[model samples]
Target: ASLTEIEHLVQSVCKSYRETCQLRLEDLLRQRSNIFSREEVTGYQRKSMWEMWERCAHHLTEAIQYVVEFAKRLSGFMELCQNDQIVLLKAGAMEVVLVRMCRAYNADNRTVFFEGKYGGMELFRALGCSELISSIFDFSHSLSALHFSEDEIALYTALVLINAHRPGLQEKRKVEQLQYNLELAFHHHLSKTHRQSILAKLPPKGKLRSLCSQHVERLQIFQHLH
Candidate 1:
């Protein structure tokens, strides 16, 4: 019963984060388009550049605030669970999804850098904001049992490594290492239930394989080239 309560809390928090992330992504895409359109007309004029920078800076601040709030909720949930006051299965699951979302955001940041749009200050601010969010996700995930299969864990870990690695650098060895990890993850970590669900949604090994394969491939292809 205590565990159930904790799980509910976690799930609620996860739902909050998911909604926030979706909104954030939409906001970001809109900002990117707006900035690019402005750049087309203004060609990096001081006023235009400053305006775009200011907007991005403001958004970054907001994103940080949102992530911080969510982190606090996660912390509270963890405390309750540790005290045997609540169960957190749903919460644990939600944490994994939120972490994955943060990972996606990190990947998108790299894309911005690769596009030659991110300046030093912008890059620093973006990375800093994302790191805070990622940290919360990591901490929350660690607290949950939600044993991810080796493949799933490997894929997630690879994202973490890729995000940590600097842009414009390719580590072939790292790719190979992640590949090995992914293989192990698929063999050892994935449960029959998980596989069934994945196959059901994707409906073909080819699509599912691509989905799994592209994460690493994107990291490798975008390395240094972006």
Candidate 2:
């Protein structure tokens, strides 16, 4: 029953945290599209690759802000040493963002909703990092297909942020304890929903690390070109 309480607390906390910073890219796109043609929002008028890359970078920076807010509200997270907090945020925030991207992706159209518009891979092709863009879309599609509820996503995000294995954590034991509790809460929640097996299907940390590295590599290249 203790674990159930943990589950409920995590579910509510995560749900509220998610609600506080809802990105709702497609929903906003829909409302704005009424007044603006699809061409305008899709960056059709963009004259250079740098513009497209800068646009994406801006949206990404905004997303990271939400991740910081979510980390602050995570149970027991703020109680950890401040150094540990920064370490985890630096390591795990982008993974959480990758996980969150699914909600804004339209799997059927193979489009990712961004900047008040829905764009397929064709739209981002100008970035000259086709491999990274395609990988991002593919990862989003895979995660979206799992169809996890909002609460599940929230718990999963906590698991990502509270990872004790992240390097540079000063409060390793403390962070590990928080991570263990969140994992238990996550499993308990899944069991209650009759989807315990879903845990096995979750993307491993290695995959996320690989994706993050690819992003960094592409970013460096982009800067070199600029």
lDDT of 1 by residue, 1-226 (tens): 2445434433444454554442444444444422333443244334443454456446445544554444334323233323121112211223233344332232322223112233222333322234443444343334223433333432442332222122332343443443344334433333533553442332232432333344334334434433
Evaluate all candidate structures by whole-model CA lDDT and list the values in order: 0.36, 0.77
Query: TM-scores of the models, in the given order?
Result: 0.31, 0.87
Q: What tens digits encode model 2's per-residue C-alpha lDDT throughout 1-226?
A: 3855786667656765666456754464464333324675455445478788788778887888898888887768889988999999988887888888888777777776666656677777567678888899998888878887777888888888888998898889988888888888887778888989788887877887899889877877876877
Task: List the candidate 2 regions with Cα displacement exceeding 4 Å.
Answer: 24-46, 223-226
* Residue 201 local lDDT, model 1: 34
lDDT at position 218, candidate 1: 35
Supply the global lDDT for candidate 2: 0.77
Best by lDDT: 2
